[PDB]
Amino acid sequence: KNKLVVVTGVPGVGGTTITQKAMEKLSEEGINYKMVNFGTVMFEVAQEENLVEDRDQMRKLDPDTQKRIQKLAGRKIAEMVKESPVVVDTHSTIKTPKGYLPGLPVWVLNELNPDIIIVVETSGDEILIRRLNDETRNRDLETTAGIEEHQIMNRAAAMTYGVLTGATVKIIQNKNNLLDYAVEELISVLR
Amino acid sequence: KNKLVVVTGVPGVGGTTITQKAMEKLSEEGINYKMVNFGTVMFEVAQEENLVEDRDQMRKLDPDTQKRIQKLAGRKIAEMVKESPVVVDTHSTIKTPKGYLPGLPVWVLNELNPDIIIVVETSGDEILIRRLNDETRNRDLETTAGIEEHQIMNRAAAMTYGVLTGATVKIIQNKNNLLDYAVEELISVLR
Amino acid sequence: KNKLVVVTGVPGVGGTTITQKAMEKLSEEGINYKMVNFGTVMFEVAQEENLVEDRDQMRKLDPDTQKRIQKLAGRKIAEMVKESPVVVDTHSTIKTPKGYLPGLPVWVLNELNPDIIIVVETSGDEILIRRLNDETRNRDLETTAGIEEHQIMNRAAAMTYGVLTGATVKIIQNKNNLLDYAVEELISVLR
Ligand SMILES: [Mg+2]
Ligand SMILES: [Mg+2]
Ligand SMILES: [Tb+3]
Ligand SMILES: [Tb+3]
């Protein structure tokens, strides 16, 4: 009966920020979500199996071990759902030099059994300017067309996740100066 | 072999209207399709299995029995294909407050084995005005952007249905004052 | 660890042209891809199984036979990957009168196990004009809206292929008078 929600969005869209704010407001009503990052849960599984010491070593693990750690992380998260509602922070797809990499390939979905997939978006212009203004980020020259293409592929992958699991797929706009509206929309879905 | 065709479309697009007109034209050449609504077949299965009584509470039913009912409904429809060609009237996704809910999750597709998935569309403007003119409705604040987003997700879910079953995915425009053109296109696909 | 790459694109986009140029340049650094057309491998499998003698007899084969040959073709290609990197030339979807037909249904994906799905594109205008200038072609002109709709569905099917296999999905623009840029992008992905 506790929900398992996946919250996704391209870098810079603010998915974790609105999720953190929604969780804190829900906590006031006695609804206590636990938030986890899928990549961090993969790192915790790999450390527990003595495969890695640091998070940087994760990207050098072979593909069969990666698929195995991915299945184990999905199972570890499915088990957390018995203790409370859970929100998973991850990417619908990651934009790599070899193309869009699904964040939840079918073997992860079969272990996770998510109830809702949330896709947080805004316009390509708003994302591009947010990334330009972030000092911790490094300039790459991704265009608004490139960001829109990533959001097109994220929506299609998220819809495929819904077909394979039965989860609903919710799209929420997190627009500049309208953060509170995105937080209220997310609270309603998480409740 | 008799065709199993799924006809989908957002509320107000007119998919069942053009399907009924297509079927009467086809019966004049001895091709007799049987049309069933997936939700009605699920409700008949739930009644046949005595899991439910007052249909309205179907949405508030245990997810495991819903999945079982969904599989039984897909199987019941696949069996009808032995008697005649079949049209399944359903939604590619239903736009709910928790997001886009797939009408045919992978467990349904595996029982149904559809040959063709039809996606009936028109512009967001035409849908919005049709809904405003319908007296049966309750006026919500759905925009043309919201309708276009639903049609984007419906196409992606329908394409995923095609990949998982091998079915072709046909998109038909049912535009204002061009209903007969949509009917002729649907007849050609159903023949 | 030889890669299996699928290169797709609507008729007239020039995907096999840029692939052959990229393979030529990769050979200079000692990387020798083998290119195969998926439809040709199905035809070779059907000749071996004594189901056909000529390529024009393939279309008549029943759906169960079609599925069996498709699985055997996927397996035959997966075996070629042991000898060298492999590129599969095929369509993400084929635009037929009954709708968009997936080129790689889930049963083919499970045998192929592709590493990368490449989607080669350009604008609907550039494709339409290229087709009008091709003497091999007939008329039955698709509009730019029809071509854009095919590219929308090809992206969604390709993203579904990525979710089901874990493959990355790369989109490459092959624009008029910028062929060398598309070749360089494809070399980087194929390496
Ligand atoms: Mg209806
Ligand atoms: Mg070709
Ligand atoms: Tb990182
Ligand atoms: Tb044999």
Residue numbers in the entry:
A (entry chain C), B (entry chain B), C (entry chain A): 2 to 192
From the paper:
In this context, we recently proposed a lanthanide-based molecule, named the crystallophore (Tb-Xo4). Tb-Xo4 is a cationic complex with nucleating and phasing properties. In particular, we show that Tb-Xo4 may provide different crystal forms of a single protein and correct the often-encountered defects in crystalline order that may result in low-resolution data as well as twinning. We prove that, beyond these crystallization properties, Tb-Xo4 is one of the most efficient phasing tools compatible with serial crystallography approaches.
We successfully obtained different crystallization hits for this protein mixture in the presence of 10 mM Tb-Xo4. In the absence of the crystallophore, no crystal was obtained in the same conditions. Because of the presence of multiple proteins in this fraction, it was quite difficult to assign the protein identity to the crystal by using mass spectrometry. III-absorption edge to maximize the terbium anomalous contribution. Among the recorded data sets, one presented diffraction at 2 Å resolution and a significant amount of anomalous signal. The protein was sequenced using the electron density, and a search for the sequence in the genomic database of M. thermolithotrophicus matched with adenylate kinase (AdkA), a trimeric enzyme that catalyses the interconversion of adenine-type nucleotides. By providing the full sequence, the automatic building completed the model at 95%. Finally, the straightforward ab initio phasing of the protein AdkA is an additional example of the unmatched phasing power of Tb-Xo4.
